[PDB]
Amino acid sequence: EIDLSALRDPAGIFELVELVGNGTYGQVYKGRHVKTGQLAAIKVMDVTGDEEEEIKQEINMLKKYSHHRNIATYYGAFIKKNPPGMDDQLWLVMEFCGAGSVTDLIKNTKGNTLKEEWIAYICREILRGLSHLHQHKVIHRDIKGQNVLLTENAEVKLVDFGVSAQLDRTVGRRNTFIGTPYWMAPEVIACDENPDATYDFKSDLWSLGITAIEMAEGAPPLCDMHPMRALFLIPRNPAPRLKSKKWSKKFQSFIESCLVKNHSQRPATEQLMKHPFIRDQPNERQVRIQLKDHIDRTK
Amino acid sequence: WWXGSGXSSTXSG
Ligand SMILES: Nc1ncnc2c1ncn2[C@@H]1O[C@H](CO)[C@@H](O)[C@H]1O
């Protein structure tokens, strides 16, 4: 429980500059601190009683976990209070990731693909991100390219804890059909019709596989299908593999490790760190400097 | 129905 009343109005503190997007269909501007000039991403939402569920959970999540360098840091919040014939506007102030999303990088990139060393780097950052959250009994529940952001220096920061889940216990499971269809894991899709269907931290690791494929082929598997079909398909079809065989054997086995249907069979996060594709990385500086230059070209 | 939750019950199964 955190007090929303505590939050003052942001007029003379921060200033909006330009649009950047919406994860939960709530706007995001390039905020600027007035006195110092420092940049920060400000998610302007509209607060109600409908919303004071996601706002309670999400803020507590960021206060606890955002400190990690793999997660866009949470600077704080402000409530902009409007007249009676209007709605109150929450401001969430966040580490500005000036290179934008992975998905945008892919779209602005000739042939909508990335060099395998880039995929293996970003995947590691994400995996370190997830391992930090997973050890703290936190599921992201919506891992994909749109929620993986890049700084001007090309360090990888996760965003959007709107549909995240906190658990009291480590043995605990969830039963809420949630996330983005293409990136959703089968045991998550199961929670749509069958109320007995439960899942856990394993779901994120699948979404990472599908993100990994997203980075390779330029989009997730079944992207050419209506979401409601991909839904029917993902449990039925053989777990997705790479299209091109110009990728390495390790990368093929990584995707092959991530995307295991049975979440009993599917490895844990702690294991996925130990995989050749992850464990043995050319060098953190070597790929990042490289990937920095491509963002800096494709601005 | 294919989309879970969203901005305060916007298509919630
Ligand atoms: N810290 C941030 N920096 C930049 N853009 C952000 C940030 N947080 C959210 N966004 C925007 O919101 C989208 C999803 O939350 C991202 O793809 C991006 O456009």
Author numbering:
A (entry chain A): 12 to 310
B (entry chain B): 2 to 14
Reproduce, without paraphrasing, sentences from the article in which this PDB structure was first reported:
Previously, we utilized this platform to identify a series of thiopeptides acting as potent and selective inhibitors of Traf2- and NCK-interacting kinase (TNIK), a protein implicated in several forms of cancer. However, the discovered thiopeptides featured random inserts composed predominantly of proteinogenic amino acids, which limited their likeness to natural products and led to modest metabolic stabilities. We demonstrate the feasibility of our designs by conducting affinity selections against Traf2- and NCK-interacting kinase (TNIK). An X-ray cocrystal structure of TNIK in complex with a discovered thiopeptide revealed how nonproteinogenic building blocks facilitate the target engagement and orchestrate the folding of the thiopeptide into a noncanonical conformation. X-ray structural analysis of the interaction between TNIK and one of the discovered thiopeptides, wTP3, pointed to a predominantly hydrophobic association driven by the steric complementarity between the protein and ligand.
To understand how densely functionalized thiopeptides interact with their target proteins, we solved the X-ray crystal structure of the TNIK·AMPPNP·wTP3 complex at 2.8 Å resolution. Like the previously identified TP1 and TP15 thiopeptides, wTP3 binds to the substrate binding site of TNIK. However, the binding mode of wTP3 deviates from those of TP1 and TP15.33 The peptide contacts both the N- and C-lobes of TNIK, interacting primarily with the αG-helix and P+1 loop in the C-terminal lobe. The N-lobe amino acids, Asp61-Glu62 in the αC-helix and Thr35-Tyr36 in the Gly-rich loop, additionally contact TicOH8-Dha9 residues in wTP3. The hydrogen bond between the side chain carboxylate of Glu62 and the amide nitrogen of Dha9 is the only polar contact in the interface, and the near absence of polar interactions between the protein and wTP3 is a striking feature of the structure. Instead, the high steric complementarity of wTP3 and TNIK appears to drive the association. Trp2, Trp3, and N-Me-Gly5 of wTP3 make numerous contacts with the exposed hydrophobic patch on the surface of TNIK. The carbonyl oxygen of Trp3 and the N-Me group of N-Me-Gly5 occupy the P+1 site, whereas the indole groups of Trp2 and Trp3 are stacked against the αG-helix residues, primarily His237, Pro238, Met239, and Leu242. Another notable feature of the structure is the intramolecular interactions and folding of wTP3. The pyridine-diazole moiety, the side chains of N-Me-Nph12, and Thr11 as well the phenol in TicOH8 are stacked on top of each other providing π–π and CH-π interactions which appear to rigidify and stabilize the peptide structure. wTP3 folds into a unique “quadruply twisted” conformation featuring two β-turns and two noncanonical turn elements organized without the use of intramolecular hydrogen bonds owing to the multiple nonproteinogenic elements in the structure.
